């Protein structure tokens, strides 16, 4: 009834080449709605097209987003992370070391130091098991506007939040459309669901 695909188990390991790395991920996740395993998105370059992720609705293991220069990770359809397996034994979502510091300037496509600015998870409502680990993302905004209490399942015994808020740039406020000022990005289509 849903499009199924496997995940990966590479963790923080450095890929053979950026050419094979993105091509493999595109081949794996394009069309996929249910990842039966771990969604790992690592070492992705600044201008990497990630539109193949648009259909992903659930991840059965953990989500790892690490060492990316890509400015935005679009997982706007991701509704649920199960935490059937965990990162560092405790975490269902881990966002780590994503890029380089940048000031308040809106990025210039070929000049501006790369790094994750926003984790676009508008549909995320459920984390069944495991916590959230967000560390060392200089350009990342909006982790601290999110109410993770509403996302953690009531049975989640490992509902941990280890969230670093340190930033190189100031965050633009959520759009007024996001009631309660909780959002994943600066757009009105980025509010917490």
């Amino acid at each position: 009834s849903t499009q199924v695909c496997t995940g990966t188990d590479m963790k923080l390991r450095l890929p053979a080449s950026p050419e094979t790395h993105l091509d493999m991920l595109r081949h794996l996740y394009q069309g996929c709605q249910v990842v039966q395993g771990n969604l790992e998105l690592t070492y992705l370059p600044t201008n990497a097209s990630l539109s193949f992720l648009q259909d992903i609705q659930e991840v059965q293991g953990y989500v790892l987003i690490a060492h990316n220069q890509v400015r935005q990770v679009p997982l706007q359809r991701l509704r649920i992370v199960r935490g059937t397996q965990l990162f560092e034994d405790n975490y269902a979502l881990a966002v780590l070391d994503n890029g380089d510091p940048l000031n308040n300037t809106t990025p210039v496509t070929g000049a501006s130091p790369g790094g994750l600015r926003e984790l676009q998870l508008r549909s995320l409502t459920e984390i069944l098991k495991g916590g959230v680990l967000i560390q060392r993302n200089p350009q990342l905004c909006y982790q601290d506007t999110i109410l993770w209490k509403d996302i953690f399942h009531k049975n989640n015994q490992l509902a941990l939040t280890l969230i670093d808020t340190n930033r190189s740039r100031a965050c633009h406020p959520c759009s007024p459309m996001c009631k309660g000022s909780r959002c994943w990005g600066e757009s009105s289509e980025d509010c917490q669901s």
Partner: single-chain antibody
Amino acid sequence: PADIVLTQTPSSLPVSVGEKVTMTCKSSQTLLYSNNQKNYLAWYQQKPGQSPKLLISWAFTRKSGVPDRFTGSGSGTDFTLTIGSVKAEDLAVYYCQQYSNYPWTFGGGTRLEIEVQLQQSGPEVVKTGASVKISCKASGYSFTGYFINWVKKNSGKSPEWIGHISSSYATSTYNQKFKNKAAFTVDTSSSTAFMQLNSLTSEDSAVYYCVRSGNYEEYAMDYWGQGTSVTVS
């Protein structure tokens, strides 16, 4: 990415107590951000002998405690500050300020005439060619959650944004004019920010401020330090 110029009118406004007053701030670029429909414009008040204080950020949002007789209005490039009924205490210079693009800039000012703490180091009297290191001690808030902006203020001139530093990531942005003049450092442990000024000439003689700014709704500069006078002989 051109520098934004803020034009303030009138540059001086004679008033009597009880009068309604309107001052204009016009921008060379729109300050409206289309993603959040917010205008990145603030107003500041500097009374004689005192450091500037935030009145309004966001074109029309007053800082907590500011009298409702002060009203900010306008959008895009056109902005006004109105005082419904002027008090004797309102006699000061009012500066509009943009935080939309680098460098952050101030208007020429309108002269009106008839917990969180930032402790700066004492006055500096130095010679030509010498250096100076101004300290800024922060208290009453989480130091790494905020930026430290540095501002130059001369008698009878509008404030100049020297630049700012991210406390947590030690990321410094400078006004082009101060690139080979000022250098920022921070110490997370002692909640102190530093600015070193080198190759000091007479043009570098002024009052210097450290100013806090934050994130989200607190994006604008809010709390100013008491100031540090540097005189170069």
